[PDB]
Design a protein around this ligand. Structure first.
Ligand code: HEM
Ligand SMILES: O=C(O)c1ccc(Oc2ccccc2)cc1
Ligand SMILES: [Cl-]
Length: 393
């Protein structure tokens, strides 16, 4: 009843060009079985959205990676929000929701926007830059660690730790084993900065500890929630911003439209998240026998969702393979959907908007002038290097 495919969604050939195999997965049926890893797969928008919005049947407490927390030990203490189900998820979710709230965005926007304009002005003085190292990575590093209230010492551990986290959502392949092997120094740094004394006042981390008074979280829960922001809020935005610049470099017509109306900056970034969703796949675990698209899935089974595929499903999107900054992107799953939908999505959109805004107002052309190198990760999609020439407006 369920088609069995040998496609390995965690192979380098899949990372290099996943779109053909993703059509193969979508067109094989609403639910496939991946013999490579003994997990169910759903690649269409309909089933991806259904799974995300049924948290009771497709839980997150048994891990959102391949590993089933009920069968193996998590490589680190489980996240109190990402790897938890309602009701345990509810109160930690509400705290991070308030820490990263609309009101909070107003306190940091000016500094985030100024930092983005300064970076673009700096990059235009150099002309030929690497849109990843010098922009996609440089800008988020200049605003997010400071917004967290982190000290200057040891920030080099942040990106290695984030890449570890997302590699660990994948199967026990080379990418995962190597990341966990080299991980000890990054865990020590991250865990230490999660302690209240090490977080500068007024920052995201200090605000998390400040919510230990309300009865929503206890003091011993705050460090892990700071750990959540250091795990989820840097590497994702880096790939998101890189994807946006990548799209603008490949679709010059859309850059010209963005220039003519910089107020499209926010939707241009949202479209980039749909087009090259930074998080390509993650898992749920069934808590019971469930019928999904005509297929019966047993209890305790891992279900792999193809978020990027769902964002290019022609059953849902018109011209899904076109980057369109005026597209109505509402409904894309680049940030997830349901109770776990990225609680830091307002920070991500703020960084992306103000950066694309700076580009829209200051840059006339973005031309690739060097070898493009991809960055391989079990669950993240992004570039290693994007050599571009920036022409001032
Ligand atoms: C382009 C940027 C980003 C993308 C594409 C992204 C993607 C996602 C996705 C798809 C989920 C859902 C995971 C699931 O349902 O299992 C998620 C959850 C989450 N994200 Fe993001 N994210 C981004 C930026 C950020 C930022 C900036 C932060 C913090 C500052 C953050 C923190 C979190 C947290 C804490 C969760 C867990 C929410 C929960 O489990 O209730 N993310 N993210
Ligand atoms: O440590 C945490 O709580 C945490 C939360 C969210 C993260 O981003 C993801 C993870 C899986 C799938 C999509 C986004 C990563 C870590
Ligand atoms: Cl850790």
């Amino acid at each position: 009843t369920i088609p069995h495919l040998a496609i390995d969604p965690f192979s380098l050939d899949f990372f290099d060009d996943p779109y053909p195999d993703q059509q193969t997965l979508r067109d094989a049926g609403p639910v496939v079985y991946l013999d490579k890893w003994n997990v169910y797969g759903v690649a269409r928008y309909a089933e991806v959205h259904a799974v995300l919005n049924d948290p009771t049947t497709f839980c997150s407490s048994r891990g959102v990676g391949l590993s089933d927390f009920k069968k193996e030990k998590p490589w680190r203490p489980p996240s109190l929000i990402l790897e938890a189900d309602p009701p345990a998820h509810t109160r930690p979710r509400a705290v991070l929701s308030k820490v990263l709230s609309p009101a909070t965005m107003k306190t940091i926007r000016d500094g985030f926007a100024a930092a983005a304009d300064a970076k673009v002005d700096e990059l235009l003085q150099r002309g030929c830059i690497d849109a990843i190292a010098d922009l996609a990575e440089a800008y988020p590093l200049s605003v997010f660690p400071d917004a967290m209230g982190l000290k200057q010492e040891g920030r080099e551990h942040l990106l290695p730790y984030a890449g570890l986290v997302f590699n660990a959502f994948g199967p026990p392949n080379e990418l995962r084993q190597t990341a966990i092997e080299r991980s000890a120094p990054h865990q020590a740094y991250v865990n230490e900065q999660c302690q209240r004394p090490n977080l500068a006042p007024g920052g995201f981390g200090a605000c998390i500890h400040a919510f230990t008074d309300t009865g929503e979280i206890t003091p011993d829960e705050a460090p892990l929630l700071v750990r959540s922001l250091l795990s989820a809020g840097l590497d994702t935005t880096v790939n998101g911003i890189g994807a946006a610049v990548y799209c603008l470099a490949r679709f010059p017509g859309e850059l010209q439209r963005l220039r003519s109306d910089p107020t499209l900056a926010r939707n241009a970034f949202e479209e980039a998240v749909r087009f090259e969703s930074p998080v390509q796949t993650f898992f749920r675990t069934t808590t019971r026998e469930v019928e999904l698209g005509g297929a019966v899935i047993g209890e305790g089974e891992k279900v792999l969702m193809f978020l990027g595929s769902a964002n290019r499903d022609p059953r849902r999107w018109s011209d899904p393979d076109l980057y369109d900054i005026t597209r109505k992107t509402s409904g894309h799953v680049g940030f997830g959907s349901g109770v776990h939908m990225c609680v830091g999505q307002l920070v991500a959109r703020l960084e992306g908007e103000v950066m694309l805004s700076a580009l829209a107002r200051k840059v006339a052309a973005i031309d690739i002038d060097g070898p493009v190198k991809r960055r391989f990760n079990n669950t993240l999609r992004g570039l290693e290097s994007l050599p571009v020439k920036l022409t001032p407006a």
